[PDB]
């Protein structure tokens, strides 16, 4: 019962090798190959298919299928047809063909072309070619790392869009900004603990907690500069980039770093609004020793340490923690930029309106004192008010601009990341389209924009530490040195 043979005139095998494997027969036909009418032409069409040498999971199941349709066995004026299971085994791994161009009519599993349950002479042939992937991709087995319809390989950990030198330059930029920001916030923490007995008043001690946030946030940024520490945070066990964390196949070094960075930076950002409110209500009672914040201290912490906690947990719940090779940390919204609109631009924008409101309102009250009471208090007192008004002015200008910078950088990624993703996809297609049978990336993110965006981040931490850059703090450390 030969449901698997069809009448055809056997021709002599002009090629005794199919995709790098020996053939146990010596007769073929172009009957099954509807796109070619000659062995030289069918062999040429196999060169085009050879581009699928990448993405091993499809190359392993399509090799037998091709050497059974283009170079099938012919004996006694009879050609052997491929089995239907041999054809079904290619629709899954090789779903990319249907996307890029579409399968040919003679390669679709049809009963007239691929009957169910037939012997295959190619099943006895050993194909040594396992499948090599281009430079940007890397071999991996876990399905959660495969590039879109490229089953068998994922994106290498080191960002393919930037070179080794561009990675080294960015790391030096972060090592420099991270160290100064870490040392500046530490200087604020030290001056507070050195005089904690008096500094622990809350209209001012809030600065201690803001610098504490940006300090811890800087620790997560500087963690990458350890031996083999960045590879543990950004990479996976197979050698591909991290994304969609948390998972169950990788470690926790990525989600750990993210919580240190996102929670600390968001906590310090909301501390800014609490500070502006504290300044706003303290100025209303200026001129007296009355404390309007006598019973609002605990309420401040219960609101500043819980908001960033709900936000962080929400990100972990939707699993949008990604890893970047250039920055050296794990953050939210790297892969899918939409999430960075609600978990970054939304909290930052809100603290700019409410925080900026109290900031402007607080200066108005400080400006009314100079006008409502002229000549009552002068000398040092008058200088302290103007110097504080100027200190709050340069501070709001600085925060307003850094938020403008962040919104500019985010809108830049919102507008071109889709195009960036196309560029890399087309770059992966040409590599197999030109070589087997030079490429260049069309568009990539701007490193300058990334630095400008980090400048607004690190700049905020250094701006928070400038509030203790006074002559009064210098005396605090001059006293501790004497007692030593």
């Amino acid at each position: 019962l030969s449901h698997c043979g069809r009448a055809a005139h056997c021709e002599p095998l002009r090629y005794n090798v199919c995709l790098g494997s020996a053939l146990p027969y010596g007769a073929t036909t172009t009957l099954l190959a509807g796109d070619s009418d000659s062995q030289e032409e069918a062999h040429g069409k196999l060169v085009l298919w050879s581009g699928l040498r990448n993405a091993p999971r499809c190359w392993a199941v399509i090799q037998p299928l091709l050497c059974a349709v283009y170079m099938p066995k012919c004996e006694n004026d009879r050609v052997e047809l491929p089995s239907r299971t041999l054809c079904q085994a290619t629709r899954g791994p090789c779903a990319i063909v249907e996307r890029e161009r579409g399968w040919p009519d003679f390669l679709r599993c049809t009963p007239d072309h691929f009957p169910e349950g037939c012997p295959n002479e190619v099943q006895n042939i050993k194909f040594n070619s396992s499948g090599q992937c281009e430079a940007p991709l890397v071999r991996t087995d876990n399905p959660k790392s495969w590039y879109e319809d490229v089953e068998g390989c994922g994106i290498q950990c080191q960002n393919p869009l930037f070179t080794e030198a561009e990675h080294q330059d960015m790391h030096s930029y972060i090592a420099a900004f991270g160290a100064v920001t870490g040392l500046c916030t530490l200087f604020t923490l030290a001056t507070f603990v050195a005089d904690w007995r008096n500094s622990n008043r809350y209209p001012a001690v809030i600065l201690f907690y803001v610098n504490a946030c940006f300090f811890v946030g800087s620790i997560g940024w500087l963690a990458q500069f350890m031996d083999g520490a960045r590879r543990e945070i950004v990479c996976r066990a197979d050698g591909t980039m991290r994304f969609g964390e948390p998972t169950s196949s990788e470690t926790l070094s990525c989600v750990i770093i993210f919580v240190i960075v996102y929670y600390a930076l968001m906590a310090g950002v909301v501390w800014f609004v609490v500070l502006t409110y504290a300044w706003h209500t303290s100025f209303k009672a200026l001129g007296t020793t009355y404390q309007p914040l006598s019973g609002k201290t605990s309420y401040f912490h219960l609101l500043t340490w819980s908001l960033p906690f709900v936000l962080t947990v929400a990100i972990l719940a939707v699993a949008q923690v990604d890893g970047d090779s250039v920055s050296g940390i794990c953050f939210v919204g790297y892969k899918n930029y939409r999430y960075r609109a609600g978990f970054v631009l939304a909290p930052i924008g809100l603290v700019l309106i409410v925080g900026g409101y109290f900031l402007i309102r607080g200066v108005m009250t400080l400006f009314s004192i100079k006008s409502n009471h002229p000549g009552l208090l002068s000398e040092k007192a008058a200088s302290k008010i103007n110097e504080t008004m100027l200190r709050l002015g340069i501070f709001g200008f600085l925060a307003f601009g850094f938020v403008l910078i962040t919104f500019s950088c985010h809108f830049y990624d919102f507008f071109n990341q889709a195009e960036w993703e196309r560029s890399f996809r087309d770059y992966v297609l040409c590599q197999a389209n030109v070589t087997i049978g030079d490429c260049e990336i069309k568009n990539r993110p701007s490193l300058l924009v990334e630095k400008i965006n980090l400048f607004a981040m690190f700049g905020t931490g250094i701006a928070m530490s400038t509030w203790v850059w006074t002559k009064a703090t210098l005396l605090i450390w001059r006293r501790t040195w004497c007692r030593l």
Partner: nanobody
Amino acid sequence: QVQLQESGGGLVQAGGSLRLSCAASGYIFSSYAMGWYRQAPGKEREFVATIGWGTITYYADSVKGRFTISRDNAKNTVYLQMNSLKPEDTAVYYCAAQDLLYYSFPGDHAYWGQGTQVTVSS
């Protein structure tokens, strides 16, 4: 830097009146906000009253009504007129002279006095 010196404290009976004063050794009396505080031998420092630039004044809940605060800009002295004293008012009343922006910024300092005990007998 200014040094304060309170006076007028002493033992008194319930329902009586007392007048405490706070003299500040130093010409800088206006550029500093001042107020009265009290601390019992087993309690934290409690807020009493304060005086602003004009008629602005703040009092505690258990103090408002009975206490009265007034300043003498010329004599660099702040007064606290206590009336109808209750035994629960027994405490060492202190006098603080702090910078205007003392609460909001760590660079500023607050200067306190020695305090005077005021005991009320039932």
